[PDB]
């Protein structure tokens, strides 16, 4: 194994050396594409070599036929996909694909969306691939509603959902674009997320998203009968989960946040009790929880002082 590393080094170094020499010479040709393909396969974070490929492809575009240039582009797509299979988390490789697709006369965006779906099957948290999917969605003018359906299938079929919930948080406002979601939409989202965290109470992503939904409302004194009833129902359901999972800190925090959403002063006693339980359960966050409790006690004093 050791001897072969010295074998790879010298080949890597000699190829690298050869590419640089060719570049100063102004030899923007296929020999460079050959040499870089060897190096970029093992080492896709070597950015200057991606720059070299672009300079060669740009130069060849001028002194080749449409059919020859089309062939070069198809070869490039294949090279990129092979590089991505080996290292799907390289900035340079994903950027070169974007650079390439952005300059094509007739890019096949549907094929690119399918590439994204396949890579997201392999790693549902690959942010490079989610970012690329957004790029393709924009370029192909794919509507928020279609992307919303994609996220749904991804959330129910398995876990590793933080990236999918995040995408939803960005897509929902676009379906209802204001210069703070509508209540009907919010209620559906609450139902969807509540299913998520009662299915897997250890999935932190649903709890983080739920905290956002609890803020995306119109106020506690503006609580409709339906939203009031839904939040009270969540509250009792969380207490249920708390008996099943007494070490589950997410459910305890969410109970506190729900009581805040419902009636700060009426639930003051219970809120303080829950802070004591939560700190016992999640000791590393004790400093955070004390600052949150202090903030809530301060809000309560201001609410009490507003009394006529």
């Amino acid at each position: 194994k050791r001897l072969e590393r010295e074998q790879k080094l010298k080949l890597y170094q000699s190829a690298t050396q050869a590419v640089f020499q060719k570049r100063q010479a102004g030899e923007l040709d296929e020999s460079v594409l050959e040499l870089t393909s060897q190096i970029l396969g093992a080492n896709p974070d070597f950015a200057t070599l991606w720059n070299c490929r672009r300079e060669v492809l740009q130069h060849l575009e001028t002194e080749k036929s449409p059919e020859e240039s089309a062939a070069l582009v198809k070869a490039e797509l294949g090279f990129l996909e092979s590089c991505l299979r080996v290292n799907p988390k390289s900035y340079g490789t994903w950027h070169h694909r974007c650079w390439l697709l952005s300059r094509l006369p007739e890019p096949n965006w549907a094929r690119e969306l399918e590439l994204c779906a396949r890579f997201l099957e392999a790693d549902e948290r690959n942010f490079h691939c989610w970012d690329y999917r957004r790029f393709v969605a924009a370029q192909a003018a794919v509507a928020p509603a279609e992307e919303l359906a994609f996220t749904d299938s991804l959330i129910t079929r398995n876990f590793s959902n933080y990236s999918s919930w995040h995408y939803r948080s960005c897509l929902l406002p676009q379906l209802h674009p204001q210069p703070r979601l509508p209540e009907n939409v919010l209620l559906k989202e609450l139902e969807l997320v509540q299913n998520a965290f009662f299915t897997d109470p250890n999935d932190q992503s649903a709890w983080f998203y739920h905290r956002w939904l609890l803020g995306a409302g119109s106020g506690r004194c503006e609580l409709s009968v339906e939203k009031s009833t839904v939040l009270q129902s969540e509250l009792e359901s969380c207490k249920e989960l708390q008996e099943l999972e007494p070490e589950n800190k997410w459910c305890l925090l969410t109970i506190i946040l729900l009581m805040r959403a419902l009636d700060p002063l009426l639930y003051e006693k219970e809120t303080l009790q829950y802070f004591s339980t939560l700190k016992a359960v999640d000791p590393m966050r004790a400093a955070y929880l004390d600052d949150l409790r202090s903030k809530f006690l301060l809000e309560n004093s201001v609410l009490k002082m507003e009394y006529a």
Binding site: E6, R125, S160, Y162, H166, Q204, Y209, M284, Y288, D291
Partner: protein
């Protein structure tokens, strides 16, 4: 749930002498040659950690200054190494190095400013280089470079702010571009950016602070986003961001200190990403810098914004006000 379990014979003491020896001897090898594409940053990591340990004199100043001059291109940008292409990442690293050495005029400062200025886009974002990759990493590189040169006024600051704020997410964090998911690395870049441009009042410190402190796992280590393994460097991005927004006390400082110390290699010196792994200069800097932010006596105070000794930033009078 995904976490490491620290074995009970992991290092529990700071081995500063071994770390200085490791960095002093680095690049005296397969990995060195394969990371030539980031050499300028490698040099920055080495010199900064040595200076935080009081050992900068053991490095070769004159050799590094000549290397930096040879990496500035005609456009004013700086490459990672001689013959490589210029990029904002290595322009920042070079300026940080020259700031450590009080040798800024070794390069053409006017041309650096022009290079940085040229990479800003109509929406206020910055590309990393002429090939156009857009990332909030580069917004930070741009303003940190200019701040250190006293030339922040050379860019469109309001538009730059507007772009960075458009990258703020539902959870209080930031991603690389508008719509991108929150990540500790990006949060460090964006909170650092907002510190430099005096816009920390626009961050939701309680919300982001919570997302950040939830990066701490039972092992004591920090991850960079939910459901990832902890790493001594995600540990650093998270701590620096928390310090910038005035919420460093929201993590368990003793448990984190023990995790960072457990990442040391007692035989070779250096820190690894996690206990028992192979060390490298990158994780050595971020392990030592993390320990300094946590208040370790043997290490110089470190800037959470610039990851450079505070005494260096005091000298050039570039000290962004933090939240607290």
């Amino acid at each position: 749930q995904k976490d490491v379990t620290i074995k009970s014979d992991a290092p529990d003491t700071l081995l500063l002498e071994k770390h200085a020896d490791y960095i002093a001897s680095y690049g005296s090898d397969y990995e060195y040659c394969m990371s030539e594409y980031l050499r300028m940053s490698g040099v920055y990591w080495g010199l900064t950690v040595m200076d935080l340990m009081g050992q900068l004199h053991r490095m070769n100043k004159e050799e590094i200054l000549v290397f930096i001059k040879s990496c500035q291109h005609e456009c004013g940008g700086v490459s990672a190494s001689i013959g490589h292409d210029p990029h904002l990442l290595y322009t920042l690293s070079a300026v940080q190095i020259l700031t450590l050495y009080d040798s800024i005029h070794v390069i053409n400062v006017d041309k650096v400013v022009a290079y940085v200025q040229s990479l800003q886009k109509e929406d206020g974002s910055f590309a990393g280089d002429i090939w156009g990759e857009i990332d909030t990493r580069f917004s930070f590189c741009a303003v940190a470079t200019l701040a250190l040169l006293g030339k922040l006024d050379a860019i469109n600051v309001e538009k730059a702010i507007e772009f960075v704020l458009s990258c703020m997410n539902f959870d209080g964090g930031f991603g690389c571009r508008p719509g991108s998911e929150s990540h500790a690395g990006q949060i460090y870049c964006c909170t650092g950016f907002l510190a430099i441009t005096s816009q920390l009042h626009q961050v939701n410190s309680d919300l982001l602070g919570w997302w950040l402190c939830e990066r701490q796992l039972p092992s004591g280590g920090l991850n960079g986003r939910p459901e990832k393994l902890p790493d001594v460097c995600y540990s650093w991005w998270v701590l620096a961001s928390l310090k910038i927004i005035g919420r460093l006390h929201w993590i368990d400082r003793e448990k984190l200190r023990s995790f960072i110390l457990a990442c040391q290699d007692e035989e070779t010196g250096g820190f690894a990403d996690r206990p028992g792994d192979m060390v490298d200069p990158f994780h050595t800097l971020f392990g030592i810098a993390g320990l300094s932010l946590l208040g370790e006596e043997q290490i110089k105070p470190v800037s959470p914004v610039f990851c450079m000794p505070e005494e260096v930033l005091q000298r050039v009078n570039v000290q962004p006000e933090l939240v607290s």
